[model samples]
Target: SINPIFEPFIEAHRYKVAKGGRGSGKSWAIARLLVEAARRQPVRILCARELQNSISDSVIRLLEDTIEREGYSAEFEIQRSMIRHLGTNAEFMFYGIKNNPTKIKSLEGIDICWVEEAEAVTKESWDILIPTIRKPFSEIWVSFNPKNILDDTYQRFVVNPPDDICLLTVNYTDNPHFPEVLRLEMEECKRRNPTLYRHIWLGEPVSASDMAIIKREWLEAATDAHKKLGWKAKGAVVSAHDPSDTGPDAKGYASRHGSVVKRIAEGLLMDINEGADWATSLAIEDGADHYLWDGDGVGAGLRRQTTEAFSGKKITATMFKGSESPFDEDAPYQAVRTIGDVFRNKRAQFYYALADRLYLTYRAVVHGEYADPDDMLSFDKEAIGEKMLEKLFAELTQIQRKFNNNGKLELMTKVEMKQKLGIPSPNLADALMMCMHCPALVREETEIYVP
Candidate 1:
């Protein structure tokens, strides 16, 4: 019998998504359902996935196994690469979506399309497949163990599903036929690491360890805290800038006061003089105590112009050198001799520090003890606006961290991030990291006054 967890998808729907964990019988049930449906009426079904080298890589075997398990072996004729229902002449075809966009273009008159392991399907494949199966009263079925919430398939099918879509989630508990061995494995996973268990057994999206440096929940909490607390600027007000020259590589600016940081402006500029003018204007208007400019590459000229424009203000040229120390000699901490030992460079150190602050601030917002109110950093959504905050958060979460060959914490380069996210650059996040260059210091009590 088909699992009851997937009953909602039995009815005709434009789009159907079945997402769940291992031993959930998602694929088994779907295959059986399609097989039975094909028996009832002639249905041209396409079983697709991201990449398949041969029919062996597809779900052809699973369908054959289901036909046998359901006692339909005599009624269905299994071919070398295709499955056919003898009664209705219904046929099932397998195709890999990637590396064969031209072949997929020929997939017409498809009554039902089953996309297995849909999580790995890229946006390009989706774009090609969505419109290719253009038959009247056609339906699409997607099934996968969610890998990342930001994945194109998850975002398209699960996060913002169409109104006519039927989305169902099933775990091992939902499958009455769940085996004892898998249950024991699940229990062991729970004991070893609950976070991993959530992703592997509960069908939850992949955790930060997979790609993201900051978790989505943490970023959401930070945004929520800003919305609730509003904007409050205290202590020193500092401005940071990361300049760029070409397309989509906008110059970014951010201002931070104590625990509150706000994105002032970030967009493409005409030239270095325009960036310098913008930075100077923001510093003067915000009454910034210190202006931090990334004095590297095209930014060096921008920094020169900015300093010349604001000759009276404190305009510091900060160049991110890999061999430089993250902590000053006067600082209290002395655990690392050079920042390069822990972080590959000052740039990595800045990103790590920002990540630490975000984690601590998220904890403070949620649990209420990891950081003090006066010390906890937060974004100023009221000042930054929701749209700006959304873009900033996207950039922040897109940053993935991993240990380099030297076993030092390293932030992915803009080019690497672009390759993963298909975006131009994370200029705003870089500017925000530069703003967090100066760590928030805890006030020390020197004298005790007894009144």
Candidate 2:
């Protein structure tokens, strides 16, 4: 969907320019709009990039994908070199603006000229190509992610913008279809390094940032995922917890119904006894079949307290000690039939398990790959607000991978991660990992977490 930011850009204008950083969907919106406009009328459209070594170097593939995605395949005949509108007298021509400068001058009746990667367009090329595509009712469109402010594209358009122009500074946040994957990534970027975050996600100039363990794309796919994958939210609720190791830090609580995460939250002002009541309340609200809590450090008494509190209810009050041994009986997790040989601890094993689900969900949503419903995780964005989401993302992407001296896989300790983030521990994410801490892909061995 085109962002409302382009409310004026798509209107009638002599010069249409959109500049943005990654995942803004500016190019996507432009491509689909142009494709739609071409399908409606017999217009001569020239699609150009700075230097197209061959047709493959240009945006022919993007146009083709756009056509297919927008269900306009039947209306256009996609040829090797050019695309033809079946009903209208319209056509799309591709050109390397630099190589085809002389050839561009010879053409006539050009309706639209869309220049992709306009950041590389030098003054010399613009001087030649601009007056060449001159027609009374013609429009020139350029889409780019700004690099250097001194470049010809920025100088001519942004610095001394022309009349009859619709110029926009688009960013990832402004995009309506901005995927959830990019949302988490942008958050992480902003957290680690604001400069890099602005440059990458906010359409500013160059900068860099540290990385996250979970892929952003995976997080995107998991949004309202059950509906997309055609899976019904079935089975018992798994309510998990993560109490802060120290005081004043937020507590984490999350519950899931089958593959869909129904609810997750952070707590404050509650000690172990009170927090135990909080878990009981939420778990009881969700009709939780498995109520799991971190049984480590200060929370060691959590199981007994919560178990006693739930005496009247029919639920399994489970303790999840991440410091304990790993559970690697699942086929995919088994490296060589010995779980402990591969995993350094239970934390390492379950963290990877969560990572595996996010990856699977990414593949299923982005690439349309088939995956087992149980193996993927989908989030209910409607269930949580933006504020809570930010907290979850922090915890989700915080833990980096580590290896012991024996080459056993390990997840960075919460304390180690806290030293780096210098923020509250990733309680929400750890709670989530604890929630999905059991083996999958096979049944009948024993009910570890799900009973």
Candidate 3:
């Protein structure tokens, strides 16, 4: 019998995603459904995953087991590579999306595409596979135990789900036939580590401390809020940039309104002069009250040029050193004492402070409380599109942290982050960090202003 939780996916939809925890019977249900559908009509099914070196690594075995379990052994002919229904002539083919991008185009006539272990798929692989399954009345079914909230599959199917998509979540509780052994295992996991139990058996996204510097749940809350706390307009509009001459480290710019920051533009440039000109134009166009630029290497010269360019304007161009101390005994712009006392330097201070804002956003959105303590951060999703927001969030979360010898918080260097993510740099995140350069000064009457 199909699990009641998964019956919603039976009706046709362009995208059907079944995401859940272990012992949910999601895979078995999907396999059974596909086999039964194939038996009913002439359907061409494509079963795919991120990586499969051989057919054994695919869902072929699951389908075979389902066929046997459903007493359809005589009706279906199972081959070494594919499954076929004798009467309906329906066929099921398996392929690894990452391995056969070029070959996938030939499957344009397929009726349904099943992506098992979908979390392992990448954005590039999804881009390729989503377009390839283009038959009439075609449907794409995705199933996975989410590893991270930021994974391509979760973001695509769950976060901001499409109107034509049917999204569902199932867990062991939803499975009437959930095995006794797995139930014991789940209980043990709950006793040993509730966090792991939530992830491994409750279908919750990975926790903040598990893999991210900035939690994915917190980022999700910021993006979904109807109204957010902090300065909306009564603050200086500041523009900041982390300029890059070429490649993915392309020049990135962000404009800040108190706690809310948005990416204005980001892309590659031919030369440093071109980037410098672009930054100056952005600063001027945005009517930035203050423009902050990184004062390192190429940025040092660019900052000088931008300062000269904006000399006659109302803008104040300042060079920011990430290594400097964030605590200023006389600066009222710093965060409240309890939270601000732990940061080691400006770099750690900004990242940790950003984290504080994100967590507060989570609390505000989930609990319906908009009044935050004087020191917190909030983002404006209205000013940025979904794709850009995801890019920036990815970079922000990728930043790892640890305690140094002095027992103070320190963020991982760009080089370390690069090694971990295999990217040249996190330029967008750097630009966003620069947006938090000078904290907003909150008044006694709850008015916030950028100093």
Candidate 4:
């Protein structure tokens, strides 16, 4: 009774890592396999975590329960500190890595070293423990729900993974045996706090660090916000485009009906005029009331061509230079802090504005905080299309916040982000941010500071 997703982990590999959300059944499956293997052949298995003060803190009870449930209770001798298969003499050992690492390091023959809650395993423990699990054909099995992206366990096993490792991301949806009780809990979390649900159930890592301006959880929370909040698209349909300068980078285009981003697209078009023509055609078809384009570098060239395409049309397009001064200069970035005082330029301003809406939407949906309609944002997940969702999420999350020489807020330069993320460019994120941009509000009566 296990998902085939765990099949790869069962295979012979130096490192087997399964990272996912709750109710994934990794712990049960892992215990099952270890016990089964132990019974088949006398094997020495080590079940370890970062810290375990006593046997009760370890997987000893789970292993014991498994033997009883699987009807192998008579074949195994369960002890206060350990469990041993009577016939095979198979031994299952447990330890806290930090408690007595030297004992673990010296343990003679470890056929399988199962690291549970591996997200808590630190660099020191990993470095020390990895080399010590060195019996021939030994395998290190790491299973964890994701935490911050910067975690050593996350970076080592999930991101910059090693060769000879079989890694899988398994979530509750992937498990057929997910409990009915957890299903209700999952739905409740998904309804109230999608971002936290993502971390607790979907197993997506948090953007908890200060480096990334737009946190990953914030974006996850904003998904399908309209559906959650029972709101319809309001105001004008705004469209935006960010064209690639040249070569392999894809052009980014987005259209939004009020706060809900209705559609996002990316494609190759090297010629500035051609890119402008194609984007303008789509905007026309969408009947967009206003269009915005990135008016930076090669993007400026598309302005002339885009203007001509919508030259005589209603609701003409305009340019937005990210390097220009911030809008809503007098508006609060926080309590008593204004946008101009906080941001270095227009790009930073808009990114923060977008981040604000995502966060506000998150607070509103999760906490029932009553925010004005203009202060929140949502996404029609289906409209964004499955094919482009991964790319967009990667692009959006990679747009980190940075401080300029003067120490005011700004996004890390596009070049810096490209290198940091090993991504070609975050054009889609830029276009979406631009689509959300609203220039200075001159109306005193309406007084909407959000962009």
Candidate 5:
């Protein structure tokens, strides 16, 4: 049965938020409205989720089930990646945000936008989307089970919403389809974890204290409204690269990997081409203590070599290293905290070339995986390389160190640097530094920029 709660919000405003407890049939309501909208025109309604992997379980499959159950004659145009009503022009499209925000602008002519599980979205994701597809009189529908109200999406439609936007709160009690088992489970949860129970079961937005980095409002301010701002840019074109080398304590046979993250900034910055926020730099882990040869004392020589490579570049390169424990007398990982702080400082304007290796290393550090620890966040080769390089830069920014009798700083060890900063192949970091130092190494067109 279609819940009446969805009727007012859908009919009253171009933007509608259908938030409530679990089992409220919010999805069913949105699905119904999508069918209704399609009946009126050649409607293109977008069905989106936070992660691409979730699309199968949450949106597409769910919509198909609902459409079938409702006996709609809409045939899905799998080839065109859409669902079309045979007798009408209505269509339902699906997509995922992942880490890219630029794709939202592609919804230019969409008549309806439906977002499921909006609570999972980061402020960054929402800010880049909302305004890009505002038609003269199109509709936006969102359905979600309330979680943390303080994060990006919830705060916008719940705490403070735009004018002409319709907001309604529903609960499982309001849902005729609420399953008996779920209702009982929710009751037990309330008795066990009262606070959490209230938030999840009742669909109340919860709050957390002292959360570090990235807030909901910052993302809100970043959204492109499309009026004076015009339409968003067309494609995603960002790229980054990282390098590594293996040794005794580390696994060998490594090389370079390049990653690309692209998005069109909605609103005023739409005209800006892709790769607008590109960065390039070097990342070396000068901490692993095993790459040094017999007695060449190559550690000191390696620094000189790298210095000669980047001495004249106008860009900033960050070096990271691994430390012992956070509480150790001589902590090995304190530099991790320090550099993370630097990047987290929202006000700081760090600069890098559009095609630099350092940027690639940073991305890898954030996204790479480790075999043993089995998690991307641990001290994997990529993470160590990132930390070691960052630590070196932090050390340099504070003071200078003297070379030992063999002409190397106490901490400078080529064997260690090589071991810690293991490269996959043709190390992207080395190639990036080479490009920075040797102008002839990179193509002239690789340096293009957009203001």
Candidate 6:
């Protein structure tokens, strides 16, 4: 079979590229090559992958097990740094290329460098490893599935074939040892995610949309069954407020203006969990006018009326104002803006309480009706003002529609919220609403105070 045919390339090629479907035994071929190299002279080989890999049973152990199976235990000692073989001057080393590039760079004379999970290696890493091959006639071997052609390794080596390297592609059919049950399981996954299954399991290069937020195969492979939620949460949350306008109809919309409140608790934003309730609660529960009016007698009276009328039952109302900081008179708005910056910057870790349903809604809103126009349209002041008013009216209508029809604004639901209100915004209303509604999901003071 093809497994036995790999021996020639192992002996001839200084650098080998092996890729294929799952259960292809490509790793095992590399394992046997390392084992043979260990039986020769003092050979130094490296097995590496990207950082913080959760995958067990990698090529490191595969090489070790192959050595043991070949009755070479007496010759090698599994030391911390290298697997030293006393009988034959050979050693196998392991390195992770996550945050440390020096580990691969500083290596001295080495017979071979074997990279498992080569698809995960960025282009810069491959560049560094190429220059560090100090050993004369040294080879670098890569064993991985055919995925992500955009990756540097694939573009450099596969698309434009380099000289002095032997490239081999294998599939599970080549492995005579593959069990029937495992092959059947691969078939099942193929049925579910045809594109992903073909690219990963079948080792075929397929075109995937660049707009995808995350790779489909990565999502399928890395998904935690325990983390998946099947049912809607017990209680609902609400975000109600008076819209802040720049002029007659110009209102700034920040994505997380409401979300910060919902995701702050449930231990998501642990960093800011120390102190952040009054402002967040005021932004979401009290209504934005409360802070603006709390100091004014008539405004205070209006605040009480709004809270009393809107507050009660499964959900509650909150207020977020664009202006609250005494210094700028727009601190609240600035703070909400900062929350949006945090999300775009990824400085804040947000846990979605309504992840299961909301994710779909979020995706739909971003790609569906609100997507940028195909004509490369630009909005002038009048057009922009009209758009803002239209958006404000839409959001208010959503809030009112759910409240009037359901007797409460259950618009926090992913299908209901993102679909109707558009993408949750930088206005901080979504963050606040999420926090207020999923009170048990997040901890107090979880939202970061941007001002």
Largest lDDT belongs to which candidate?
A: 4
Error of 3 at 118 (Å): 4.1
- Higher-ranked by TM-score: 4 or 5: 4
Across 206-272, the per-residue lDDT of candidate 5 in tens digits comes to 5432311222332222122111123222221111222222222211111122211111111111111
lDDT of 2 by residue, 1-451 (tens): 5556766766789999999898888888888888878888889999887898899987788889999987888888988879888988688999987888878888889989999989888888888888977888899999998875646798789889889888888888778788999888889888886656666777775311233467544776787788787887776678888877667888889998888888888889898777778877888888887887888778897766787877776677777788887764343444144777777788888888788888988888889999988888888878866667666865675567764798877777888766654556788888888888643222234443442
What TM-score, to 2 decimals, does candidate 3 have? 0.56
Q: Write the per-residue lDDT of candidate 4 for residues 125-212, one digit (tens) a residue.
A: 9998999988889999989998878679999987799999998888999888899999999999887766678889999986544587
- For each of the candidates, the C-alpha root-mean-square deviation to the true structure, in angstroms, is 14.2, 16.7, 12.2, 16.7, 17.6, 17.1
Deviation of model 1 at 334, angstroms:
6.8
Off by over 4 Å in 5: 74-81, 99-103, 208-451
Would you give me the overall lDDT of model 5? Answer: 0.44
How accurate locally is residue 438 in candidate 4, as Cα lDDT from 0 to 100?
Answer: 52
lDDT of 3 by residue, 1-451 (tens): 6666778778989998998899998998888788879989899999999998988999999999888888889998889879999999999999998788888877657999999999899999999998888887999999999888767788888887877998888899888898999999999988876767888898887534443578767877776343544345446777888775345577778886655565446767447777778887887887787788776656777656887888766676777667777756234444444333566677777777677777777887778666543344555576777777778877777777865886667887776766544456777787777777665454345544555
Model 3, position 49, has a per-residue lDDT of 92
Candidate 3, position 253, lDDT: 80
TM-score of each: 0.53, 0.53, 0.56, 0.56, 0.46, 0.47
- TM-score, cand. 2: 0.53
Judge candidate 1 at residue 169 and give its lDDT.
87
- Full-model lDDT, candidate 6: 0.47
| lDDT, candidate 1, at 69 | 86
User: Which ranges of candidate 1 are over 4 A from the true structure?
Assistant: 1-211, 224-231, 314-340, 419-421, 439-451
Candidate number with the higher lDDT (4 or 5): 4
User: Candidate 2: which pairs clash?
Assistant: 181-220
Candidate 1: tens digits of C-alpha lDDT, residues 6-66: 7887798999898988889889889989998999989999998999988898999999999
lDDT of each: 0.76, 0.79, 0.77, 0.82, 0.44, 0.47
